[PDB]
């Protein structure tokens, strides 16, 4: 429960693992979501048409 006590307690190499993995897990999860949604709209299919993609 006292997570933010533990995060300060941990050593610097472990703290950098948590640092790096927090950011990268967030980046990759939201990248998955962006991939899926821009695929549902069809913007991933090459040369689909003049339909304006929801993310260029």
């Amino acid at each position: 429960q006292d997570v933010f006590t533990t995060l300060v307690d941990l050593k610097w190499p472990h703290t950098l693992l948590i640092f790096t993995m927090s950011f990268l897990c967030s980046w990759l999860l939201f990248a998955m979501v962006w991939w899926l949604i821009a695929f549902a709209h069809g913007d991933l299919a090459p040369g689909e048409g003049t339909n304006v993609p929801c993310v260029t």
């Binding site: 472990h14 948590i18 897990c25 999860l29 899926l36 549902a40 069809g42």
Partner: protein
């Protein structure tokens, strides 16, 4: 011939999500991927704090 989640065969024309997105023989696979990449990246910080 770059990598591809679906199959690039048929001159890379299998991504057309028409006839309903859920009827895309490849997109349903992507939906099944989502829960796994959600649990991994909501638990990794907790497992690492452990």
């Amino acid at each position: 011939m770059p990598l591809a989640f679906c199959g690039t065969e048929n001159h890379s024309a299998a991504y057309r999500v028409d006839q309903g997105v859920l009827n895309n023989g490849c997109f349903v696979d992507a939906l099944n991927v989502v829960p796994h990449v959600f649990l991994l990246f909501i638990t990794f910080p907790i497992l690492f704090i452990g």
